[PDB]
Amino acid sequence: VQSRTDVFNEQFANEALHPMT
Amino acid sequence: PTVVQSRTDVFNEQFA
Amino acid sequence: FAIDPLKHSKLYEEYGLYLRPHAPTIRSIKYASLIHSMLAKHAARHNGTLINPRMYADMITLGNTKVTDIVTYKALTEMSTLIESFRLPSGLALIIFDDEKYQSLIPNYINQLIAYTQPHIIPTWQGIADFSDTYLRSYFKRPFELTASNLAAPQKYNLSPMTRSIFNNTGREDAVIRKLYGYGEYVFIRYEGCLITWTGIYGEVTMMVNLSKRDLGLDVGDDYLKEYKKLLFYGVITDAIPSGISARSTIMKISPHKMMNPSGGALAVLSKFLEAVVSTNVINATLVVYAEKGAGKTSFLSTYAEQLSLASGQVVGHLSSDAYGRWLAKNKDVEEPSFAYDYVLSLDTDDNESYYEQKASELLISHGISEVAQYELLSVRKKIKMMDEMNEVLIAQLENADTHSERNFYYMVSTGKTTPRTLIVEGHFNAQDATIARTDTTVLLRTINDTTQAMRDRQRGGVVQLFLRDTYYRLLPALHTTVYPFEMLESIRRWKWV
């Protein structure tokens, strides 16, 4: 099992908009 | 008097 | 249309657009061909320029203007009588395809009219214009797709040779279909490329290839590794990265498709490097190629230097991306290293261990990451906290110029006696621009890969490879021109040698 999200390019994009406080 | 001395004397009197 | 369909038809033959035979909309394609001829005659009359373009734009496009000394208005009145004889209820809309090769072939006398007009822009999906558009529907034939289930005589479906133009997706040679099922009257649209759909980790994926389906040896069911190196040179993936393409992907479908056009922005920067290779004025000529770690670049560039040597005749060197990492892992202790080119090229084999992979492996074990499954669980704030600790060990090499510094390494190799005149150097990240040098041409190379799915599969490096990709990715925007592997091969073909 894996997701289009665990990739770093993506993790990074999201890290960018719900930046994780 | 030299010019500077005259200038200094004038300055002192006004401002004593 | 911007480019006259009647004269240039071979240009439109590429997109799948064939002209109808020759009908109120058919007479309009002959009128526009008379308007192009009247413009190019008036244009070449004065220094290749139209004298009063705002009139031509309205007379042709809006059709609302009539005109009635010898230089000025004698040409407009010749155009006014031509368009008045057409008796159209409305003008002719200036049409342009979204394609980049198309927009660059427009004659200069139409470019003068474009500022005064509202050109209809036809979107191209794969590079092939959409046949559902209005102007492409009336002027050109409408294709019909023959497939395995669809195939029968032209009489079954309603088809006339003067309307539909057959597109053979059946996989059987067009000579069969034409002769056996009675299509001999119909004209087939011919595509020199290929379009593939691979299964993927995240879903279905598409790929375009510049090889014909008979050249590429693949059919439905064939594996991604079979004919890999043909796909690596000529392939492009049209899905957002990351695509799910991995080594276990299989082919769902294949269809013939239009060959891609190499970007004029890449062929411009690549032909800037071929002017240095030739010119006797330049002493050393270096090309700096960046790529994501795991994209299969050294497999490609080693065969790019073969094609560049055979065409030019000069000797071409290649420094792999890890050339400095592997050299330093040995010579970090030696106080007077050997910078000889043939020496660096020996340490550059894959069996050696790079220096950065040693420093990064210690950095992982100190956080307790022994396995790729563990690195996936970490939070993004936690990964970037580890990566910032690589950026501190990366600056150490670039920050200065020493005997072991990275600025010095590529300096002593490029300026050596026995090193080749022309080189190809591979960087990991943009900060090396000031180090690997000194060039007016640097490019970034994209391939067909999922570089996070490639570093995940390989069982040798494991984590240390996947961790360094993400570290370099974080340091490498695409700020330099993007070049695909087939645009560097096409760049040599289009260049004329001697």
Place this chain on the structure above:
Amino acid sequence: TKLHNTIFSETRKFTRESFKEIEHLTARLANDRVARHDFLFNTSIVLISDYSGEDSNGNQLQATITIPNEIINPKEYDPSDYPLAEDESFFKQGHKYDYLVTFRAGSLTNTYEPKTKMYKLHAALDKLMHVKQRKSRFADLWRELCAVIASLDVWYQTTNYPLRTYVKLLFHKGDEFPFYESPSQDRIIFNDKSVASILPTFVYTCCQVGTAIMSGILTHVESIVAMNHFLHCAKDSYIDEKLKIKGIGRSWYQEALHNVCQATVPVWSQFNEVIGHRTKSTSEPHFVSSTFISLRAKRAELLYPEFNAYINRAIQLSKTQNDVANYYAACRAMTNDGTFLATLTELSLDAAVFPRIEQHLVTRPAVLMSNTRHESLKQKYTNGVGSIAQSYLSSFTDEIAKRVNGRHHDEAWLNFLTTSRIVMQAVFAREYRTPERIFKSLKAPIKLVERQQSDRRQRAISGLDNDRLFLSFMPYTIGKQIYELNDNAAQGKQAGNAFDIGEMLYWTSQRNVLLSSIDVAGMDASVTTNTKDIYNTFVLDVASKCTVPRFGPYYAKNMEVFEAGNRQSQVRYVNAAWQACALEAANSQTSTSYESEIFGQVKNAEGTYPSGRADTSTHHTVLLQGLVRGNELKRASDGKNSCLATIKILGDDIMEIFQGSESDTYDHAVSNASILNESGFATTAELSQNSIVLLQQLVVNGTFWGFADRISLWTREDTKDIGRLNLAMMELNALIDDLVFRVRRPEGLKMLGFFCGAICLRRFTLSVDNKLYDSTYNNLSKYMTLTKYDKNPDSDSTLMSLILPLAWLFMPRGGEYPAYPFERRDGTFTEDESMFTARGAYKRRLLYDVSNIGEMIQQNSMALDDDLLHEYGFTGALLLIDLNILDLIDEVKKEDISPVKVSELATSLEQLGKLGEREKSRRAASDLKIRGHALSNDIVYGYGLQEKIQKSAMATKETTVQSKRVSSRLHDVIVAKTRDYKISTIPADALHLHEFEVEDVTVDLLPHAKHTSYSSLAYNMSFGSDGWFAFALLGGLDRSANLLRLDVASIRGNYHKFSYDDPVFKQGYKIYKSDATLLNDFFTAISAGPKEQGILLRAFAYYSLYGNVEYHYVLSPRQLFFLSDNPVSAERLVRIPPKYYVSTQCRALYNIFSYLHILRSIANNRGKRLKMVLHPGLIAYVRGTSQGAILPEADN
């Protein structure tokens, strides 16, 4: 003979006999090169081994003249000084010497065979020492050395001073000069081959030291310490040691002024006025004091032990703050010889334009949306310097997209191609509508443009390209819109007054202030590829909102687009701005390529883009304010206070001012330092309580410390030297004016500038025809002295040299320079003129003043005195001016007055901006040329920027010997004018007749004469000096007047006072008098604002009735720096006898008479009030003309 024994030397006045003597001795030096060798090197000179005297503050000092052996007996040229790489493709990476090395001038020879690697190299090094060392502003390098020493003879009345021994110990070899410069070959030609190779640059260094003694900075004892440091600094490389020391040597003033502790200084308000004085303690904070330890250990190691012992002396013996100022003026002239720094441009290319990585690596933003090429469209930062910088700049995106929509960008680019018509639209349609255009500009190389500068390495700047500037034109348009939304940068017009520094004289006077000044000059290398991506996220966020239908070759269309989180390509409507900004970021090739004669084509590394153009000056301006202001918002998010008051981003500087407690201002000033590190810049701010440092200025405690070593009188960067006297003598008045408040003794710049124009600028050569030759020499010799040359049978013309009559320097329409006292018939002398005298038409008063005026009023005569003026040589000097032989000066050259601006950020943005105005004024001039009235190109508005673009792009030789031909026509005029000639008076000279009688009443000084008496506001005005007492009488400066002239200079680009002789008026009155309906088309051609249209349309109605009546004078803004611009300030200093109110109603004219006479006499002014004495013919002239005709500029 000799100069120091002249009557002028002792009395410093011009009598009849002592003017001819000084006119003769300068005519002998300006001509004979035998007499110059015998002037400098004469045997009567007694050498000085040891000398003693007082330093700048009066304390006694003992120095010794020591010249090292390595300069006198140089080493042989060592080829390892300039090593190559193994492949010999460029100079070796590490190499010490970027400049000349000191070797025997004959040791360098190329014996190699031509067209080899080494032959080309030694051809360039031979071109380095023979060519690059030639920089001279006025005349032969030896004539510039005499002017410096000739003035020192006359000033000190002796031949015995230490500077003259260096001239003899160094440059005296045999009976001829060791070297000389030939203008035909553009080279230095060595006579003695054994002489050192670096001495040709010590002729200029003895000039800049000799200028510092006359200037009053250095004394003769400090002249030794200064010249021993330079001679020490030259081994092996002279300029390489200065650049290494330069910082170390000037930075001690912070520590010397800490030990002074308390100092009383003036206090300034916002409004450019002195409101009082204040006693503050200058002790620095603890975090500043900790840096004094690291500098002591550094100054001890690197500095020459005699010069280090002078600094250690200035920290102890400094008593008050003025004493620190006087040492920092000397220690600055000891480290700087003023010459422009030159190399082979591929020697200095490494350390200048080569990129470098520092501190932290910058990282990429997350890509939220991308092109089908995976080129980024919109993007955002996770954290770091990126997010801080965006948290500020992202607030401007929707305000700018409003303004970027209002523009028309296609019409914006035509205005660039045109100003640097139907023809041009065919060009734009062929060139820029094709996708092939984007391909041509990616394939084009970037040339390397360099510009020399004093006391700094050669600087690489970016010139204007058509193809490369088109890619970045769209981001620039979006980027420059912030300049109107902020105070954070100074792009404004520069006044030149103290109005310019007036905002940092306010904050150095404030309480609880911490003053940060960063030197950003070396930043453009520190910028990396990932650093520019902080600016791209600002532009791509503005371009996504901006909607432009087309910017060629881009269309607004539905584009396939990838997004984050969506696996398939979306479709958006992507406008032509955000296609054009997305392609400029994704395709980035920074690296310049210089083509070297040695190595072929050399190409720089990819990192650094130079800062020259307006487009990448906005990149550096937006990025800094984004980091520094965005950091202020990040603190408030952390709960910390923000004490930052203001930020000004200058050209080479960032000036922050913090105000608060010592704990807060430091903690904030430190976190702004760490954020420029995290972004990759290695920089150290100078944190100081009471001083704030910039280029070419230092502002300490509400005072001004000027840098006089940055005005180089004796050298040039251009080497455009030709035989043009008017342009040269105008160039000298611009430099002398520029040093007035940067110098401690302006009375010495008048004697030094007199022997420059007496020796260097004197002779002028013209080429007569063969048949008219003896007829010319006979007519001109009645007035001007000439030198005949042999006739050459091989040509149809003959050269002959003309040495000017010495009084030409003082004449109104020729060269015009402050006069020395002449002698009337009465025995009385005219007033010795100051540096504050007004040039222009005001200089004609010198003829009536020598006449004199006092006798003309009593005898009711307006008749000038012809007999004296002919004896001092005024007649021959005015006849020379009447013939119009000397070269003309354009109005465009006048537009460069050459004050050096404080911020160069506006110099950059002035190049490419304001296109719609320079186009509309271009339409006007052409459409007006068609109508039958043609305007000269110098008057049209945008023409000044068009010439500097095109003319600098030519490599064609500008070196041509200047010889004017006397043809049949001009010889016909000579015979006429030279026969009956007597000086021509014009009716308007009746305004030049007035006299001031000194009364017995002293005048009240302004209350700010006291506040400026403690610590002085500038070197030239100290307590009692001539600049102080003039500032006590006429208080400067008028704020609401300087705001009004900067509102006018914001249209025309520069301010010039109205005159009826101004060629703008003259041609404007031709239109008015013939076809009046074209005035609207004329006022746009020159871009006169609605205020200047009133000044002209009135003066047209005055000039119709009255002719040319105005009373005209020229006072430069750099000349009067702190002093007042407004003549009403002298209204209280002169009494007008009441009988002139009845007859004449012109009051504001009597104030301009009073204002100009007070500035002119300040050297002689003891403070008594004056009385106006008017000529009867002056009164009768004034009351036949309206006052508005005399003063059209002012509003009565």
